[PDB]
Amino acid sequence: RFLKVKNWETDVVLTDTLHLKSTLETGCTEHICMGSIMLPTKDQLFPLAKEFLDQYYSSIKRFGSKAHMDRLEEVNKEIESTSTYQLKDTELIYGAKHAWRNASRCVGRIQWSKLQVFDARDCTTAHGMFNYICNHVKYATNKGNLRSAITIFPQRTDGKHDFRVWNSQLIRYAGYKQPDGSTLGDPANVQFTEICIQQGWKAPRGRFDVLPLLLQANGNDPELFQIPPELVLEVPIRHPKFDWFKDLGLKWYGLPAVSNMLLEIGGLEFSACPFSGWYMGTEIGVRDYCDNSRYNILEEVAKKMDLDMRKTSSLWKDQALVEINIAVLYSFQSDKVTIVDHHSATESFIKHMENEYRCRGGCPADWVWIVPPMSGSITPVFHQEMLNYRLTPSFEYQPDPWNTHVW
Amino acid sequence: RFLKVKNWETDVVLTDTLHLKSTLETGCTEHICMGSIMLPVRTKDQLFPLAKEFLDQYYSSIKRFGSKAHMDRLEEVNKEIESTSTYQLKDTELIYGAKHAWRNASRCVGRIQWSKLQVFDARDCTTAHGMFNYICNHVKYATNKGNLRSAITIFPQRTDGKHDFRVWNSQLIRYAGYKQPDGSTLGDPANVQFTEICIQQGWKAPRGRFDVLPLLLQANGNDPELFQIPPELVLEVPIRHPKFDWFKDLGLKWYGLPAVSNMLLEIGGLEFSACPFSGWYMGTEIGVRDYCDNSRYNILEEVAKKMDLDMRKTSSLWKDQALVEINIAVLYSFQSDKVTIVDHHSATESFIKHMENEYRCRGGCPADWVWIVPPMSGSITPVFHQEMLNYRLTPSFEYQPDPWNTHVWKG
Ligand code: HEM
Ligand code: HEM
Ligand SMILES: Cc1cc(N)nc(CCc2cc(F)cc(CCCN(C)C)c2)c1
Ligand SMILES: Cc1cc(N)nc(CCc2cc(F)cc(CCCN(C)C)c2)c1
Ligand SMILES: C[C@H](O)[C@H](O)[C@H]1CNc2nc(N)[nH]c(=O)c2N1
Ligand SMILES: C[C@H](O)[C@H](O)[C@H]1CNc2nc(N)[nH]c(=O)c2N1
Ligand SMILES: [Zn+2]
Known part of the structure; x- marks a missing residue:
């Protein structure tokens, strides 16, 4: 006991x-x-x-x-x-x-x-929600000094008058399915992106289009709003050794903001x-960029590095992974946007x-x-036994609104 | 259900x-x-x-x-x-x-x-000497000159419960660890306690960084006896790197046969x-855990220095970078010497x-x-993304207490 x-x-x-x-x-x-x-x-x-x-x-x-x-x-x-x-x-x-x-x-x-x-x-409407969210975004961003x-x-x-932010995160990139059969932008957000279009968003079919907010007040129908671009702090990704890295055209947003819980x-x-809060580097560099069902850039990066990608045992994937994560941290740090590496965190x-x-x-x-999705055992948490149990107050998952909504 | x-x-x-x-x-x-x-005792x-x-x-x-x-x-x-x-x-x-x-x-x-x-x-085994013979044969068969079986x-x-057969070694082949009066450790810090037991039991320690431990074998609940595995049966692999020529001069090697004996x-x-x-090793067992755990050989610093990585801030990811090179080197060495090994992606x-x-x-x-999930590069392996259910089926392998804590000495 x-x-x-x-x-x-x-x-x-x-x-x-x-x-x-x-x-x-x-x-x-x-x-x-x-x-x-x-x-x-x-x-x-x-x-x-x-x-x-x-x-x-x-x-x-x-x-x-x-x-x-x-x-x-x-x-x-x-x-x-x-x-x-x-x-x-x-x-x-x-x-x-x-x-x-x-x-x-x-x-x-x-x-x-x-x-x-x-x-x-005191919020009563979706426009009010938008205002509150813009203020949150601006405050939290703080010109790169995140709070x-x-x-x-x-x-x-x-339960019939729920307030819901339909976005899974306040700031995310859209996802588009190509007639090419491939996927443009973030594959994780394809379905949500369609709901935006179906509800009226005019998508610019780019690769890094910041999504619009879909806001639901008092159990009413959700509405669309665009976050002022000047409030969305983004970071172009460069490497501190590979000049070619910039040509990949990668960027990410500075503010991690979960809105679906x-x-x-x-x-x-x-x-x-x-x-x-603020990002741990691996979230972007390991998961967002290198997950197969995400931006999945490992192959492109490895080629630019001219690695032997014939045999898994050359660990070309692992080598590229490190460099990608080096670039992420370097780019945020260079632009003075708060970020933490997995060792520090x-x-x-x-x-x-x-x-x-x-x-x-x-x-x-x-x-x-x-435990971070890279270099697990060289971080102290790997060796730390942990007991998992549920305390309240809590953040809980909840069903996506489009499945629940009596339209 | x-x-x-x-x-x-x-x-x-x-x-x-x-x-x-x-x-x-x-x-x-x-x-x-x-x-x-x-x-x-059942x-x-x-x-x-x-x-x-x-x-x-x-x-x-x-x-x-x-x-x-x-x-x-x-x-x-x-x-x-x-x-x-x-x-x-x-x-x-x-x-x-x-x-x-x-x-x-x-x-x-x-x-x-x-x-x-x-x-x-x-x-049909009855004595510690008999155990030794059986274990040599196992090692020779399993090694198979590098084509591990x-x-x-x-x-x-x-x-x-009073006549147990026990192999006191946690693994059949492993390197000695020695604590120095200054507090530093020579060899494998994981094996200090057991090495001390072996020495007490009469083992003459060479006291180097890679001394293969003797076997400590207990038959029929009797006091354990020491045996040296014939060196010619212990297949080892000098670790080098395919592009970094200084890596050989780190003086690292490992044994080819991973053999758990304490379960x-x-x-x-x-x-x-x-x-x-x-069985045979997955590369990360050696290259990540054995070499790079802080509590083990702990070579990250020395390797990172020789690569001349920026080591003043963790955000350079010097540790991650060195870790990959070490693991490439382990895989490369084993493959070059034709000793069976598998990478964490394949496995x-x-x-x-x-x-x-x-x-x-x-x-x-x-x-x-x-x-x-492997101890490096977790999410670029497919198991990271795989939900798994953990439950216990029999037959099974179980942990048991360390024999030096339970043994009743005959003397
Ligand atoms: C300020 C720096 C913060 C850091 C470095 C951080 C880091 C992380 C990371 C890496 C994860 C794993 C997420 C994933 O892998 O998708 C996570 C999950 C989570 N974070 Fe934090 N976080 C921070 C702030 C916050 C704040 C301010 C809150 C709430 C007030 C919060 C609540 C949560 C919750 C509830 C989860 C689990 C969500 C889920 O189960 O999907 N975090 N955090
Ligand atoms: C043939 C190739 C094999 C590979 C590549 C392999 C791989 C592994 C690895 C990487 C671990 C984790 C070890 C650690 O982190 O300390 C492990 C654990 C384990 N293996 Fe396998 N193994 C192999 C063969 C075997 C065989 C032949 C047996 C038994 C007949 C076995 C039974 C077990 C058990 C019981 C564990 C859990 C150990 C513990 O809880 O301490 N394995 N294996
Ligand atoms: C508050 C906060 C801080 C921080 N460093 N990271 C987070 C998570 C941010 C995040 C941002 C994001 F775009 C997506 C996700 C997870 C997507 C769903 N998972 C369950 C597959 C998470 C949140
Ligand atoms: C049969 C087998 C195959 C394979 N690839 N790997 C193994 C494990 C080998 C091994 C060899 C070894 F020397 C030590 C360990 C783990 C010791 C206990 N941990 C908790 C510190 C494991 C066993
Ligand atoms: C505390 C934690 O359970 C412990 O560090 C575990 C984590 N996962 C592991 N996984 C493997 N394969 N081997 C290990 O020794 C460990 N150690
Ligand atoms: C199946 C498995 O639970 C799933 O891949 C988990 C593993 N651990 C994770 N850990 C974090 N921090 N974030 C994740 O999305 C996941 N995904
Ligand atoms: Zn459980």
Whole structure:
């Protein structure tokens, strides 16, 4: 019931007590581990509220206070009357920060307490949503000196008045299927791109077309908006040794901003809660550029390097992979856009774990997602045992809106 | 019940039914995933159902389920159990069992080869000297002058837990580690404790960076005895790089034969506590883990210096760059010397095909993603994108405690 995790590089052992507070389920059982699977009423509401308010009031050293009891009573009375309840600003900010703190798949959580929370609960329309999002984008970008932020739209009511950002991320490149049979731009975004066109977007059929926002307010029909180009900071990718690299025509955007997840706080559900931090280099250079079902540039790069691509054992793929990731980091750094390499980031995370174990009694972590997609065992997280469990508040996946939407 | 796994690169979906035959536990619960945790004398009572489960599987596999031969065998085993408190496997059952333990090993990427395993029956062995002879023969057969052949040698099963056969070496061939008074380490830091035991047991250490350890062999629960594997049987490979000529001067080599000797083979409830097995190396085992772990030979710095990489900031990815060159060198050396080796691209691609074949023919393939994905370049291998289900089937290979912690010394 008290669990130990070992680091096999350092022999440091940590003891986890925090998992006992866990409430949501894992997908795993005593007979089967699903650790590598990517996607495994009033009566319901009050214990969730209580659960949350207890941890909130504990966090401010006011557990068992009159203010605690009063709030507990006030929320209880409000649920009986209104079926739901509204969070105080203080609770909202606490909840969002802790959702991030509890994100077991996030290597960047050392930063969790430094998060700018934009309260957009007064938003009523898609145009309003657009305004709020432009402001988020500009604030977070900060001329390349990135700052973590979340913008939080009104909470779910009856599920028929959901606010949704249809984009999976605030900033992404379009995807187009060619009559050539091939794929132009980002293959991951082909279907979403069609929904944009079908809803009226005039696509420029390029390779790096920043997508438009598709915004849904109050359960109404979604609408299209274009982020001001001057608010989308992009970085042309060059290599600090290969002059030819620039001719590949690669660029990426500076702001990673996830917009499709569900924020759950104290039983309440925030269906539209876009959040952003800054990139770890491998996200772009390993996954975005080298994934086979993505931009898949390994072959082109290798040829420019004149590698023997006859036999896998020459490790030409591995060599190109490194150089591509070198270029990414170099290009962001040169243009003063915040970025972190996988060594720095995993090193920070180990320090964060040790802090969390020391100050909270644990840190839920998903090894499968925490270990970088390149050079795994030369990062300290590879050698770190991690316990994965679900704490609340949380960010959760939710179904894409086009499957759910009564049009 | 049915379970789906998805490959996120291809959208290929597979359906697992095999997990219904799972017995042993995972360590996980509905509240916690222990998927990245490294680690987790039997009564007649529990033994016969374990025997029966096994014998049912065996007779199904040879398409004689329910046959008179099947029924007589169950009969014969049941009686032998209630009479002698244990039982003996037939040669055929032993071979079937060993192959399936490998086939079931969810942490092994090399399982496409599982049906080609040479099984050496060493159940007639009685002394440590006899163990030595068997192990030399295994090493010679498996090495095959560089054309490596998978093999396993199976020593007598556990009886009361007081007469265990054990190979004290974690692997048959491995380099010594020596801790210096200044705190530095000569050789393989992983093997310091065991090296110290060997020395205490009377081994004369040459004290170099690549000293092959002697074998420490325990028969019938007696105190272990030291033996030196004939050097001419230990195939080694000097590591050089195809373009960097200074790489040879790093003075690196490795042995060709990876042979795990510290695990326990369970077949039909019987426990084989000494069952050394061998295959051939995937390059990253040596080039990534052995050479480049901070806790092992740790050569990243020296290599990076000789390549003259910018090492002042990690963002140059000097470590990643050096790591690739080292791994090219390992593969290059082995291939040049005609010693069997496989790269992590070939091996993972072969595993995916094996896994899919297993799903179609067997209804599943238990696999541990955390171990299957190679320790470099993870997502440019197809296993990274493959959802996997991890569960435990028997027969199986299991960890067991280190013998120096449990052994009762006779003196
Ligand atoms: C500030 C620097 C940050 C870094 C370096 C970072 C890094 C990462 C990385 C590399 C991943 C894996 C994503 C993937 O492979 O697709 C991830 C996942 C995740 N991050 Fe962080 N992140 C940062 C900020 C944030 C913030 C501000 C939040 C929320 C407020 C957050 C919440 C999450 C969540 C919920 C996941 C898992 C999402 C999923 O399961 O798909 N991150 N992060
Ligand atoms: C023939 C070529 C083979 C290849 C390329 C191969 C590859 C591998 C690799 C890379 C690992 C991970 C090792 C580590 O990271 O320490 C592994 C683990 C394992 N292999 Fe295979 N292997 C082969 C043959 C065999 C054979 C012949 C057996 C048994 C009959 C076997 C059983 C296992 C088991 C039980 C593990 C898990 C070890 C543990 O948990 O410590 N393998 N294999
Ligand atoms: C907040 C944040 C910071 C950071 N460094 N990275 C992220 C993820 C950004 C991202 C950006 C993006 F465009 C796509 C994805 C993942 C796509 C869906 N997966 C599940 C296949 C993620 C988010
Ligand atoms: C049979 C076989 C084939 C193959 N390609 N590889 C192996 C593993 C070889 C090996 C050889 C070795 F010396 C050490 C290890 C791992 C030690 C335990 N870890 C947790 C530190 C493994 C075994
Ligand atoms: C199947 C497997 O779970 C899938 O490929 C995962 C593996 N680990 C990952 N880790 C991160 N950080 N991001 C990912 O998209 C994935 N994909
Ligand atoms: C903590 C973690 O489970 C540990 O470092 C594992 C990770 N995956 C591995 N995978 C392989 N093949 N071999 C290993 O030793 C490990 N070590
Ligand atoms: Zn699990």
